[PDB]
Amino acid sequence: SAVKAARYGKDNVRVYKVHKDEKTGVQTVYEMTVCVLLEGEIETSYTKADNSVIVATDSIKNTIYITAKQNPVTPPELFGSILGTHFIEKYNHIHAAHVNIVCHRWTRMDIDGKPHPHSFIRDSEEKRNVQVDVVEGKGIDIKSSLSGLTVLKSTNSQFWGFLRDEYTTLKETWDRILSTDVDATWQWKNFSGLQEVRSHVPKFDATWATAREVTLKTFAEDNSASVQATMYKMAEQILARQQLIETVEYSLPNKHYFEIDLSWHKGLQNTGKNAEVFAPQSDPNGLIKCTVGRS
Amino acid sequence: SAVKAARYGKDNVRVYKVHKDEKTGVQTVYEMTVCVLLEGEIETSYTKADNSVIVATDSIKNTIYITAKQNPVTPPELFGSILGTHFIEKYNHIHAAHVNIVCHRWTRMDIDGKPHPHSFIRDSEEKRNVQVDVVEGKGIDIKSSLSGLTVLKSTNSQFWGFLRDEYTTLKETWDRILSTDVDATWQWKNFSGLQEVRSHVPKFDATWATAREVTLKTFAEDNSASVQATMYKMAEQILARQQLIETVEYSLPNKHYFEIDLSWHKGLQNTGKNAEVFAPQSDPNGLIKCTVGRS
Amino acid sequence: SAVKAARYGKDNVRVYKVHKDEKTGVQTVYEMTVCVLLEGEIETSYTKADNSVIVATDSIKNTIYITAKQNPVTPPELFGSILGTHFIEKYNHIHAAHVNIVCHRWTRMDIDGKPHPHSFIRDSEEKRNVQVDVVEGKGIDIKSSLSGLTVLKSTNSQFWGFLRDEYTTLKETWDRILSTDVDATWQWKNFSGLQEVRSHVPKFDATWATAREVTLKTFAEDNSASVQATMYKMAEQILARQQLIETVEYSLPNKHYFEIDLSWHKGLQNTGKNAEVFAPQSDPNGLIKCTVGRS
Amino acid sequence: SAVKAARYGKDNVRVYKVHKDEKTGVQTVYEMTVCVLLEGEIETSYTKADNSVIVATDSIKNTIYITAKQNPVTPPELFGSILGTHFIEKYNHIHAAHVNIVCHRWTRMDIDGKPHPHSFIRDSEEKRNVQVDVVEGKGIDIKSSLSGLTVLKSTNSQFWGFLRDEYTTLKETWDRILSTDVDATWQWKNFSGLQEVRSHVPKFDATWATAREVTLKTFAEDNSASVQATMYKMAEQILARQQLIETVEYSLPNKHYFEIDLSWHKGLQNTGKNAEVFAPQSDPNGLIKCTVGRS
Ligand SMILES: O=c1[nH]c(=O)c2nn[nH]c2[nH]1
Ligand SMILES: O=c1[nH]c(=O)c2nn[nH]c2[nH]1
Ligand SMILES: O=c1[nH]c(=O)c2nn[nH]c2[nH]1
Numbered sequence A, B, C, D: 001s002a003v004k005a006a007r008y009g010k011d012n013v014r015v016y017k018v019h020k021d022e023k024t025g026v027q028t029v030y031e032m033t034v035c036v037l038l039e040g041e042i043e044t045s046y047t048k049a050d051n052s053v054i055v056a057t058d059s060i061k062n063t064i065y066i067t068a069k070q071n072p073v074t075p076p077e078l079f080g081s082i083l084g085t086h087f088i089e090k091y092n093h094i095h096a097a098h099v100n101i102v103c104h105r106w107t108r109m110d111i112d113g114k115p116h117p118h119s120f121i122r123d124s125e126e127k128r129n130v131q132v133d134v135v136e137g138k139g140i141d142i143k144s145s146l147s148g149l150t151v152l153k154s155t156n157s158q159f160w161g162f163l164r165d166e167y168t169t170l171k172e173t174w175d176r177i178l179s180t181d182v183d184a185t186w187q188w189k190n191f192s193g194l195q196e197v198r199s200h201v202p203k204f205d206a207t208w209a210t211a212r213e214v215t216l217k218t219f220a221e222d223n224s225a226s227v228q229a230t231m232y233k234m235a236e237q238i239l240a241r242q243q244l245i246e247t248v249e250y251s252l253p254n255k256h257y258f259e260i261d262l263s264w265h266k267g268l269q270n271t272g273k274n275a276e277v278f279a280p281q282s283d284p285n286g287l288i289k290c291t292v293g294r295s
């Protein structure tokens, strides 16, 4: 037998950082969960019990806190690139670092119509994420994403004209509820190293904001022919607005809400045009994916 | 042996209802999870296998959907009172109904600064809840609550002057992070029945809004001497603003964020006034409760 | 306003303890999650910002580890009684301690038919729990429980003869699946203090084992007329086998498995006597409770 | 823009099947959660709102139940292969099916030392899984796995001789706790189609059993030099015992248990050789992976 692939490191490292403006007294907080996995010339730790090649996972955890102390943690694309670059430059035998960051929302509170200097609210479990792969001699590959964005529209979704055969019971519809949890990922062109990532720093927050805005607007305004058709429209617009993105991937559950026939009870009408009360279904769910790239 | 207490019913009933304004085209959605448990002269179903006394839990589920079809579902205090009253009036041998409702957020989307007529976002896992106990000949007891409201302030929290003995290692502090998930419950004076609940309908949404506003403002503005002292201030204000409330209960975790000493690494300063990077602790957590009532 | 009730302390304290037999080399591990909440003359911490009355929650956490170091942690009824007694005896102004313990399973591995001296497996998320309330001058009240015991029988469950009215759609059945997660609690007679709890130490593990055995046997062997009837039989037997128990409480979900009609597809028969494939339902679920005591 | 990749289908389809032996009266239950995603000539549903190419996800759900009705559901490798083959053969324009199955434990109860004919217990959240990719003209690729197997050993784990630099605080140790949740995957050689999968049916359950047995034995008996070294030993043995496996992958968290220094309290000794009480850490955790293949 032989080691074909190996990676190891520290997962679920929770980090909080505060920035304090001494001039204005305004404080800003960032909270993230970080995972760092390394690859390189480490096979002998598995095959020969040779720990001399292992940067202890506890040391990786220390390094994450030290790096956060000495560098900005925003945008997360920059922080992940700095963190991953550190490991491949510091250790001769480590040749790749894989950094995943989940950013948690701490939104400044408005108290009496004014932004509060040091109080925050978690408005939703929506996350902003990055995956940064730093590979020695191959640059920095970054995938940025938003996840956990849960939306519903109560009309202006349709689904008809699908294949009907002896396995089909679903009725065609011209008016249904559509609800999903949005997972959207945009993949940046490969960067040659940290200097190039630094040169594009303003694009990271702007592109996140654009991806979010396009998702919400398209969902709300599209008279949707299917999840497939609506998600394609989203991906097309994001690619049009940011030339440094190579691909956009969406993964969308179709969270079903079923009509409830109440006609057995005193002829009560609660289907089709009379549908008012529905039963949200926890499972099963449709799952629709697509990756859109350039011609 | 004898049956000392018994209750049974249906839990985790998910319900969605849509309201459509034909004039404006505006749609409004409500989604809830409902539990109904009944009590009464039902001992023989346990002791003698006498199912004749059992209103099937499946029928309870049907009744919830039928009631939602025929009545408003908001405010939830009113809907729960209607639902509970139904069971004690319909069935001679059922003498109490216990209704718990969790309301999920579907907040209307703003697209280009304008409220969208039929698209919604789940902005946070914060819930608005009710517990309604309808007891034949004893009226309607309602407890209203908010839960899952997660907040953090990065300064203006202190904790010093506590008991110090041979079990104590905690250092006094004049500047710490304070973060919690707020669970707040206000208990209404007993209502004689549905007519009285109906007469107070406008107070339910207003009092929820007041409880939320007081919680957020007090948390943000109090230079907190302890969780205990801050929560008391919240409860005091709510009782002052709504005379029909008898008690206010708060249950608050103290979600700890620990300083990280980095001085072992090149004398890096990250404690006390130099603290920038902290480690959020998943467990253990302080848990502080109090119930405040009138003199 | 006035403080009507207050309690505070530390939740989610994870504790592991190992016992090492030096003679045999056999090691035994215990892992628990502990919560301790205190009550007493502590109102002024809420109303006057007087922290002098507060035993810091961090100190409570220390005390839990110190107590586990110096005392056996099994049976959990004994450990909880020792822990709660400590707080009311140590602190003049603390008059009640409320201790909740969840015990996690670490079951010794069998390797080649022989019990291993120091290796363990988590066989199921079933828990053994205690709630211990130690109240100065009122003794020690203990409720013991098992929870998270998930079972299913594929036949020998029936449900017919229930109330049928205009809200009823459920068909009577003489053969259905019955599946539940068992939550069972037995409440001990009040103990005068630690000496009396110590005198009954052997009864705690034996009664847990009896409660588990009776639950499993009765579930498997009863030709069940309803959840209600089967659970009563369980509670009756436990009370008969242990005179120091005053009440037994069961709380059982009815986790539904629905038939799937496949007759629309080539006349496929999958209902009633031909039912083979079913759809487990995640929600809603029946919920049935009862508390059984002595005549 | 262009569609670079697309797949869609139904996730979280819960299925239960019962087998009844009419001779012996013994019943056997199987419960699974199934996901099926399809690929093929479906781009136009995304780009042109052409639903004619879509096999509705609701129809996929129907097909899963119908297939379970007409075929054995065990071993899951066989069931997944049948299910995936169905879609690529039935639909001209569908060219790949991706089937994921999670099998849930329902273990027959022993009542009074005898196996019960129709009563079952969920002994642990450990799963047996398969991933089956059926690609037209490229055969059937199957990855089998076990996951959620949680183990702990209280001694006979060491970790010393790792890289020490200015980021390192971890002390070397010759005696520590080791606990993990095992995720192990074995990848079968490519099969040409259903006939070949059928010819190897007995190997699937046997290899699962071998993988489980090797994992448990090696974990319990290895005087572990690191997670890396122990996991390699496991993978090596599995490959030696089943020639039709090409690779074995393990992904293991290192779930840390920290010593608690209690010396500040009356010189209490609870570290090194005197360590009895430990603090399980919920996060962060080490994460160690490796893929082992043949020379
Ligand atoms: O087994 C281990 N492997 C590792 O890589 C490691 N790093 N810290 N502790 C560790 N333990
Ligand atoms: O055992 C049962 N008890 C009940 O009360 C019930 N209601 N519907 N199905 C049921 N099954
Ligand atoms: O606000 C607090 N209240 C408390 O009771 C406590 N105990 N430790 N830290 C604390 N902080």
Ligand SMILES: O=c1[nH]c(=O)c2nn[nH]c2[nH]1
Binding pocket: A159, A170, A225, A226, A227, A228, A254, A286, D008, D054, D055, D056, D057, D058, D059
């Ligand atoms: O938008 C949808 N896309 C689909 O593929 C599908 N299948 N059933 N319902 C559906 N809705």
Ligand code: NA
Binding pocket: A087, A088, A089, A090, A091, A092, A093, A094, A095, A136
């Ligand atoms: Na390197």
Ligand code: NA
Binding pocket: B087, B088, B089, B090, B091, B092, B093, B094, B095, B136
């Ligand atoms: Na009544």
Ligand code: NA
Binding pocket: C087, C088, C089, C090, C091, C092, C093, C094, C095, C136
């Ligand atoms: Na006392």
Ligand code: NA
Binding pocket: D087, D088, D089, D090, D091, D092, D093, D094, D095, D136
């Ligand atoms: Na095909």
Ligand SMILES: [Xe]
Binding pocket: A180, A219, A227, A230, A231, A252
């Ligand atoms: Xe969508």
Ligand SMILES: [Xe]
Binding pocket: B180, B219, B227, B230, B231, B252
């Ligand atoms: Xe607070």
Ligand SMILES: [Xe]
Binding pocket: C180, C219, C227, C230, C231, C252
């Ligand atoms: Xe039961």
Ligand SMILES: [Xe]
Binding pocket: D180, D219, D227, D230, D231, D252
């Ligand atoms: Xe391991």
